[PDB]
Amino acid sequence: GVGDLIRKAVSVIKNIV
C-alpha cells in the first residue's frame, strides 16, 4: 500500500538535505 512507494521519494528528500 502507501508508504512503500513514497519511500523511494522521501529517502531522496533526505539524501540531499
DSSP class of residue 2 equals T
Cα three-residue angle 13-15-17, rounded to 5 degrees: 70
- Structure-determination technique: NMR
What is the C-alpha separation between 17 and 11, in angstroms, rounded? 10
What is the C-alpha separation between 4 and 17, in angstroms, rounded? 21
What is the C-alpha separation between 3 and 17, in angstroms, rounded? 20
What is the C-alpha separation between 11 and 3, in angstroms, rounded? 11
Residues after which a C–N gap over 2.5 Å breaks the chain: none
Residue with cell 512507494: 5
Cell of 2: 502507501
Residue with cell 533526505: 14
Residue with cell 513514497: 6
What is the C-alpha separation between 14 and 1, in angstroms, rounded? 22
Residue 13's identity, in one-letter code, is: I
